[PDB]
Ligand binder design. Structure first.
Ligand SMILES: Nc1nc(=O)c2nc(CNc3ccc(C(=O)N[C@@H](CCC(=O)O)C(=O)O)cc3)cnc2[nH]1
Ligand SMILES: [Ca+2]
Ligand SMILES: [Cl-]
Ligand SMILES: [Cl-]
Ligand SMILES: [Cl-]
Length: 159
């Protein structure tokens, strides 16, 4: 199955002109927990953001331009990206905006972190209809010594 994993500020903001103005190691740990030992598909901007390959995951970059790093797999279409994942139980789509938009219709599961930050968004998560999704997990957390904002983890399954 295909799943999307994303961190959403208020108004579904997922990306800004520059790095997001928060420090959420707990969210990064959640991201890692839920992507480890699964193939991850990302777009080129997200690849640049991360800086290097995500450890312990097959990294697949969806882009129309040729690849500039040999440590990851470069593909040019959605179907090629899926094919490159092979026969696995779950493929994780990790953004950004355009990649989420292309994979949402195929997705059966969303792993969302909702962050209590009001920011001006450059890119947004797709406008999904809550009516069509069932929350099967929710966990709320306050800001703390290591995390700059309150955040809530949710797992949705398509109804
Ligand atoms: N929940 C969630 N949070 C995110 O910040 C997030 N970010 C993107 C893409 N951006 C990023 C940026 C960095 C790392 C990252 O460095 N993750 C590490 C853990 C952090 C660390 O160990 O320092 C990893 O191994 O997964 C992942 C995704 C896509 N989906 C997300 N989903
Ligand atoms: Ca429920
Ligand atoms: Cl976790
Ligand atoms: Cl991207
Ligand atoms: Cl629900």
């Amino acid at each position: 199955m295909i799943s999307l994993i994303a961190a959403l500020a208020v108004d579904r903001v997922i990306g800004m002109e520059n790095a997001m103005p928060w420090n959420l190691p707990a969210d990064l740990a959640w991201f890692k927990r839920n992507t480890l030992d699964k193939p991850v598909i990302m777009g080129r901007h997200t690849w640049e953001s991360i800086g290097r390959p995500l450890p312990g995951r097959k990294n697949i970059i969806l882009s129309s331009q040729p690849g500039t790093d040999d440590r990851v797999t470069w593909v040019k279409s959605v179907d090629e990206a899926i094919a490159a994942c092979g026969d696995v139980p779950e493929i994780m789509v990790i953004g950004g905006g355009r990649v989420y938009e292309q994979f949402l219709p195929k997705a059966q599961k969303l792993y969302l972190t909702h962050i209590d930050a009001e920011v001006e968004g450059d890119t947004h998560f797709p406008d999904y209809e809550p009516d069509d999704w069932e929350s099967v997990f929710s966990e709320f957390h306050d800001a703390d010594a290591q995390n700059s904002h309150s955040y809530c983890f949710e797992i949705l399954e398509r109804r």
